[PDB]
Each structure stands twice: as structure tokens, then as C-alpha cells.
């Protein structure tokens, strides 16, 4: 019917002076462009069809050709940045924003989708979509008393498009647009659909990825408790962005971090630090490292929740990227901790896995570990126990590793290892 047309035939139909012929050819293009196997996007662009599709978006009197053109353009804009740019260059942004008000839900939804692809291209097109006024009509589509009366697919596509308006940095989204979107995001974060939850979590994770003033705008909306609840979900597509957002938040101030602790986040970390997905373990250990970079009373909460043995665990056995994050967690803990906290750390068994990791090729982790060792010796000095520690490091092979590190290409490694040996192993 409209299946498997050539681009030449599509062009002949769209260039006819016959609206129904144009509609049939546009539908044929839509079908070509929605085939999984190598849709001929560049041929359609080269044939000059984007401006015709864009003008069809304005044909209020023929809603089927609005829909077919919107779909075709959606799939072109889903391609490379140069393909998305061809759509933008054809004037698509304001035409799609005008379609957001369509009385036909499948057309408004297609416009939502196209704008999500355009904005998802990167900061510049995101910001251009915002400048053409997309946020007001997008948010109006969600101004219903109960989100559950909306079609599920429709709500998921709106949530995803909103998340692309929150995505990307250099620059981050405009502050005023973030403040305009955030109350709707907060509402979507309490909706009962797993895809809506995952994508509104991702949006929050984007918005907390930056300076502490962005973190603050999010935390002030009171979402940390809901994020902690989602952190405890069974669905990995929800836990993943929830954990990224929580981790981002604890990169901020001591007070921002404290909101995460206050909300009960630490009780989830026995599972996260042993999670079967390596990326979850890595990001949870990164998060812990930012918490152990906090105040002594926050380190103490880590202790109270039983998480130091879990850190020992990941230092002992985990993917190497996770072990690096654990090494950071230990260096921060030893930098900021009380003497009693550092003693506890040693009694949980940190020394041996810490030493075993000095045989690693990564220079930065060696530096991190040597700083931690030095911090621990400084705690031992205040107790006159430097000798017991030296013995402990000797019994597990750590002295050999420090010696060998003296002969290390990097300067900081050589210096720190030589200082350690001369000061505690001579």
C-alpha cells in the first residue's frame, strides 16, 4: 500500500498538488523511516523533504498528515546530530511546539517525542527548544488532578522529554527553566509507573550533577526521602538513577549530605555495596567516599550503620574501578576521622586489603593508598602504637610493596614510600 516506496516515489507524491497524494507519500516515508534495518534518513534529507514535512505539521485541516509528518521527522531527529540539525534547520521547533496544543492526543504525543529528540541532541538545541517556549505547553499537558487518568505511553513520553530538558552540561539547563520544571518532576517522582519513576529519577540525577547551588535547588523541594525510597526499589532501572542522584547530592555541602543520611540512605548500603551489578557497587562506593569526606559525626553514622566492614569487603574483592572508589573512601575516612574511628577501621581489617592494592598499576590509587597509610600512622603516633602498626603492615607483605614503590617512576609515590620507610620501617 504505502509499504516499500522508493524515495523517488515519495518525492513525486509530496510534490503533487494533491493533499491526499501528499498524505500517502508522507505515510510511505514514515514507514521507510521506522524500519529498524538502516532507515534511509540521509536519502530523505538529500531529497529535500524536511521542509515539506515541516509545512505539513501546520495543516490543521488534515490531522493524518500532521501525524505522519510528525512521526517521520521524529525518526529523522532521532539520528545523528547532523540529522537532528536538518530537522531544526527546517523550522521544526516552533511547528512542533504549536502541535503540543493539538486536540488529537496521538499528535500532541508525537510532538512531545520529536521535541525530546531535538532537546536530547545537546545543550544548544535543548536551550533553543526552551527559548521557543516549549516548557509551558509541555507542563500544561500534565496539569491534571491525577496523573493516572493519562495514557501510560503518553505520560512516559512526556516524562522522558522533560528529562531531556534537564539533561546535559556545558552549560547546564537555565536556572529559570529548572525552577519551572522541578515541581512537575517532584510530582512524577511519586507516580506509580516504573518507567516514569526511572526517568524522573534520571532528570533529578541530571539536575544534581553540578555546583552545590543546583543541588540545593533540588534538595529544597524535599525530594531526598522519596529518592531514598526509590534507592530501595527492586527494579534496577529505578535504583540506578536514584543512586546517581543520591551520590550527586552527597558531593555537596555537609548539610546537603546530612539530608541524605537523615533520610535513612545508609540502611540501604549493605545491599548496594554487595549488589550483583558492578556499576551499582561502583557508584555506591563512590557515594560512600563522598560521605566519608564529611564531618566526624557523618563518619560516625557510617560506623554505626555497620558499613566499615562492607568497605573492607569491596577493598578486598570487587571490580578494580570499585576498589579505586573504596580506596578513596578509606583515604577520606582516615583524613577526617577521629583517632577512635581510625582505630576501629584498623580493627575491621583494613590494612591487609589496603596493602594488597599497592601492587596495582594505577598511579593515582597508589598515591591514595599511601596517603591513607600515612593518615593511619599519624593516628598511631598519638597512641604510641606506630610499632604495632609497622608490624601489622610487615606481616601481610605491605613493607615489601612500599619498598618496591620507592623504585617507582612517579615522584609522589617514590617520596611518600621513602618517607614511610624511613619514618616507621628503619
Amino acid at each position: 500500500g504505502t509499504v516499500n516506496w522508493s524515495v523517488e516515489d515519495i518525492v513525486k507524491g509530496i510534490n503533487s498538488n494533491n493533499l491526499e497524494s501528499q498524505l500517502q507519500a508522507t505515510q510511505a516515508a514514515r514507514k521507510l523511516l521506522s524500519r529498524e534495518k538502516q532507515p534511509p534518513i540521509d536519502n530523505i534529507i538529500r531529497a529535500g523533504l524536511i521542509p515539506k514535512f515541516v509545512s505539513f505539521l501546520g495543516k490543521t485541516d488534515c490531522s493524518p498528515i500532521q501525524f505522519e509528518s510528525a512521526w517521520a521527522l521524529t525518526n529523522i531527529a532521532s539520528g545523528t546530530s547532523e540529522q537532528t540539525k536538518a530537522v531544526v534547520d527546517g523550522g521544526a521547533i516552533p511547528a512542533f511546539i504549536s502541535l503540543l496544543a493539538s486536540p488529537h492526543a496521538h499528535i500532541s504525543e508525537q510532538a512531545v517525542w520529536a521535541l525530546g529528540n531535538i532537546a536530547g541532541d545537546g545543550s544548544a538545541f535543548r536551550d533553543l527548544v526552551i527559548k521557543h517556549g516549549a516548557i509551558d505547553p509541555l507542563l500544561a499537558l500534565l496539569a491534571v488532578p491525577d496523573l493516572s487518568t493519562l495514557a501510560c505511553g503518553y505520560l512516559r513520553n512526556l516524562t522522558w522529554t522533560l528529562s531531556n530538558l534537564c539533561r546535559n552540561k556545558n552549560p547546564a539547563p537555565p536556572l529559570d527553566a529548572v525552577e519551572q520544571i522541578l515541581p512537575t518532576l517532584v510530582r512524577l517522582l511519586h507516580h506509580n509507573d516504573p518507567e516514569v519513576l526511572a526517568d524522573s529519577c534520571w532528570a533529578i540525577s541530571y539536575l544534581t550533577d553540578g555546583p552545590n547551588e543546583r543541588i540545593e535547588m533540588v534538595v529544597k523541594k524535599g525530594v531526598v526521602p522519596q529518592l531514598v525510597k526509590l534507592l530501595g526499589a527492586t527494579e534496577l532501572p529505578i535504583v540506578t538513577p536514584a543512586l546517581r542522584a543520591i551520590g550527586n547530592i552527597v558531593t555537596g555541602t555537609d548539610e546537603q549530605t546530612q539530608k541524605v543520611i537523615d533520610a535513612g540512605a545508609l540502611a540501604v548500603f549493605p545491599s548496594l555495596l554487595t549488589n550483583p551489578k558492578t556499576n551499582i557497587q561502583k557508584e555506591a562506593t563512590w557515594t560512600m567516599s563522598n560521605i566519608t569526606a564529611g564531618r566526624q559525626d557523618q563518619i560516625q553514622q557510617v560506623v554505626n550503620h555497620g558499613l566499615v566492614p562492607f568497605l573492607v569487603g569491596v577493598l578486598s574483592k570487587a571490580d578494580f574501578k570499585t576498589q579505586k572508589e573504596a580506596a578513596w573512601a578509606i583515604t577520606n575516612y582516615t583524613s577526617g576521622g577521629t583517632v577512635e574511628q581510625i582505630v576501629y577501621l584498623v580493627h575491621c581489617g583494613i590494612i591487609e586489603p589496603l596493602m594488597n592494592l599497592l601492587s596495582a598499576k594505577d598511579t593515582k590509587i597508589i598515591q591514595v593508598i599511601l596517603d591513607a597509610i600515612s593518615n593511619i600512622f599519624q593516628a598511631a603516633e598519638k597512641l604510641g602504637e606506630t610499632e604495632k602498626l609497622s608490624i601489622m603492615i610487615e606481616e601481610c607483605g605491605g613493607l615489601d610493596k612500599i619498598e618496591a614503590l620507592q623504585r617507582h617512576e612517579n615522584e609522589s609515590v617514590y617520596k611518600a614510600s621513602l618517607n614511610l620507610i624511613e619514618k616507621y620501617f628503619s
Binding site: 524500519r35 529498524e36 546535559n168 540525577s205 546517581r244 567516599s289
Partner: peptide, 21 residues
């Protein structure tokens, strides 16, 4: 305190979605 770099990846899922047949 260690943030993600500005060059970091916010999401391994790409931002764009095609609408399949």
C-alpha cells in the same frame, strides 16, 4: 568530595529514541 567531571556521562542510555513500526 569528588564530583563527576563535566565531560562525564550522565546516562549510558542515549538521549534520542526512534519510534519503530
Amino acid at each position: 568530595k569528588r564530583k563527576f567531571p563535566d565531560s562525564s556521562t550522565q546516562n549510558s542510555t542515549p538521549p534520542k529514541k526512534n519510534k519503530p513500526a
